[PDB]
Each structure stands twice: as structure tokens, then as C-alpha cells.
Amino acid sequence: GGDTIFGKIIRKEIPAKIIFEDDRCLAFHDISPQAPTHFLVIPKKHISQISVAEDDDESLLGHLMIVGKKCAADLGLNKGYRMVVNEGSDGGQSVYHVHLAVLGGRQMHWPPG
Amino acid sequence: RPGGDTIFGKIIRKEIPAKIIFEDDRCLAFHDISPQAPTHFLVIPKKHISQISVAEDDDESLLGHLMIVGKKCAADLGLNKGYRMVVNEGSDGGQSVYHVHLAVLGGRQMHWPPG
Ligand SMILES: Nc1ncnc2c1ncn2[C@@H]1O[C@H](COP(=O)(O)OP(=O)(O)OP(=O)(O)OP(=O)(O)OC[C@H]2O[C@@H](n3cnc4c(N)ncnc43)[C@H](O)[C@@H]2O)[C@@H](O)[C@H]1O
């Protein structure tokens, strides 16, 4: 599952505040939250960046968004939220394991960085 | 109507002009009129979904397709240094047009936090 810190989290080698898990993804609170609610949804398959995602992983990527949607509702984000995928240096990608960030609990501003 | 009542539905049906990047049976990619980065485009489903919070479980493939199309368009547009994908939901998310859209921003260093 990869040699990043997110791979270690998936393997339960280091702790994280887990929100949801299934057979193909994991959702957990971000260690550096930028909003009152800030969590990540990651695939268990090690896709390093969205730019290299294959066509066969189309529904898996959508699964991350559906899981993010359901976790946001369970966490009470009834006023809205923002989902973010960072790619590469210009995108500010901090870990080379694809992650969908979900931020809410405050007004999110424009531009988004 | 196919596409919905919003301005994005009218773009889908060619009723209002747009600068189209990619089009298939499931989605449409086009440039944002108010760019927040040197390159800033949107990927929308042709099926009207008002917001991500009301997406159905069976919309999984469609939502993932928006992301795949977004990354393919970003590569075709030469965003080799990277980019940021953004889905705004509701008032706190900054959503104004209630037709789901995935925004792709690149061509400059994006900052943290993402708004
Ligand atoms: N033809 C087009 N082609 C390509 N890209 C396009 C496009 N049109 C939009 N886009 C882009 O799509 C992206 C995402 O869409 P959004 O960000 O969700 O929508 P917006 O165009 O940015 O509207 P705005 O943020 O300016 O809200 P407003 O001040 O008018 O008003 C503030 C709030 O008050 C609401 N409001 C309006 N009238 C009201 C009224 N009488 N009473 C109460 N509220 C009202 C509004 O719904 C709004 O939410 C944007 O980046 C946008 O540039």
C-alpha cells in the first residue's frame, strides 16, 4: 500500500482519528486542520497522484467523493463544505498518495488558495 | 430539460456560449469566466445534480469521471507543474450555481489553506 505516511495510517502502523473505513478507502481527520472540520478520504490502493489515475479507477475516485459526502453529513456540515484534491508542486500536494480533503464548519473563501 | 435550469444547463444545450475544452455523453469541460488562476476551468455532469450533498450512490462512476476528465484536460492544457481540484458545496463551500461542478485551477502556485 505504499511508502508514505498515509500508507502507514492505512496499515494501522501509526494512529489517526478514523471516521470511516471500508474495503477500499479510509477517512480520517487531518493532523493539520485548516477548518473546524477538516478530514481526508484516501483510497487503499496507492495512487500517487491524480494525474496518474487510470481509467479503471474511475468509480473508485467517485467512491471517495461519495464517502466524503456521507462523512460530511455525519459530522454535521449542513451549511456546506469544500472538497479539494491537490496535484503536484503548484497544487500544493503534501503527500504523494491521492487524498480528497473535505473542509467545513466555517465560511470557505475565494480564491481557494 | 437535459442539463437542468441553471446557466450550466443552458451551456450544455448550447443556448449560451462557452469556451469548451472537452465534451462527451456524460460531462462537459469549459473555461471559467472569472478565472482565479492563469488556467481555471470547470467539469460538470450533463445530468443535473444540484450539489454534491444530494448525489446518489449510483452517481459514483459519474463523479469519478469528472475527476478523470479534469486530470486529462489539465494535462492537455499543459499544467505539468500541478493544479488544484475544488468542489464547492453549499453556502459555506462558496457554491453559487446549484449544478455540481469540479473546478481545476493551475498555472501558478496554489496556497494553503484552500480558502
Ligand atoms: N457562463 C459562465 N461560464 C463559465 N463560467 C461561469 C459562468 N458563470 C459562472 N461561472 C463560474 O462558475 C464557477 C462556480 O460558480 P459559483 O461560484 O457557484 O457562482 P458565481 O458565478 O461565482 O456567482 P457569485 O459568486 O458572484 O454570487 P453573487 O455575487 O452574484 O450573489 C451572491 C449570492 O446571492 C444570491 N442571490 C442572487 N440574487 C439574489 C437575490 N435577489 N436575493 C437573495 N440572494 C440572491 C446568489 O445566488 C449568490 O449566491 C465560478 O467561478 C464562475 O466564475
Numbering used by the authors:
A (entry chain A): 14 to 126
B (entry chain B): 12 to 126
What does the paper say about this structure?
Diadenosine-5′,5-P1,P4-tetraphosphate (Ap4A) is a ubiquitous second messenger from bacteria to higher eukaryotes, which responds to environmental stresses and cell cycle phases. Ap4A then binds to the histidine triad nucleotide-binding protein 1 (HINT1), thereby disrupting the protein–protein interaction with microphthalmia-associated transcription factor (MITF), and the released MITF eventually promotes the transcription of mast cell activation genes. The HINT1 protein is a compact and symmetric dimer, with two adenosine pockets at opposite sides. Here we report that Ap4A specifically polymerizes HINT1 into (HINT1-Ap4A)n (HAn) filaments in solution and in the activated RBL cells.
We then made an H114A mutant to inactivate the hydrolysis activity of HINT1. The complete Ap4A molecule was observed in one adenosine pocket of a HINT dimer (denoted as HINT1 Dimer I) in both co-crystallization and soaking structures. The other adenosine pocket of the same HINT1 dimer is vacant of Ap4A, because it is blocked by the crystal packing. Interestingly, the Ap4A-complexed structure closely resembled the HINT1 apo structure with an overall RMSD about 0.238 Å. Only three positions including the residues S107, I32, and D16 surrounding the adenosine pocket had minor shifts of 1.3, 3.8, and 1.9 Å upon Ap4A binding. The two HINT1 dimers formed a large cleft with their adjoining adenosine pockets that accommodated Ap4A. Therefore, in the presence of Ap4A, two HINT1 dimers were integrated into a compact (HINT1)2-Ap4A-(HINT1)2 tetramer in the crystalline state.
